Amino acid sequence: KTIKITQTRSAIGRLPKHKATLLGLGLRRIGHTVEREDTPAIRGMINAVSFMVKVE
Template sequence: MANTPKKIKVTLVKSTIGTIRSHRECVRGLGLRRLNQTVELEDTPAVRGMINKVSYLVKCEG
């Protein structure tokens, strides 16, 4: 039985228009392109840091 990594669902709930460039890049790095799009990502410290940086733009569920 392999150890499957935990997943996090991240949804873009607020537009990136008018935000800081590095925040827009974080949203793109998470794989989010359009509003209300949801992606499922591995639960890693890097992903957590990106979510934390743009927490005002995204909704996250474990």
């Protein structure tokens, strides 16, 4: 399995944990479309930053 994450808001004002989650997923600029696997871990990261990512 391989899904596409995309950023949709920016990581300026956010917490250290959300900065770290976006750095760990590897989405730098907004409008970044990255490919990741489908682990419960990556599903948990998308659960943690659900307000600024967009999964397909």
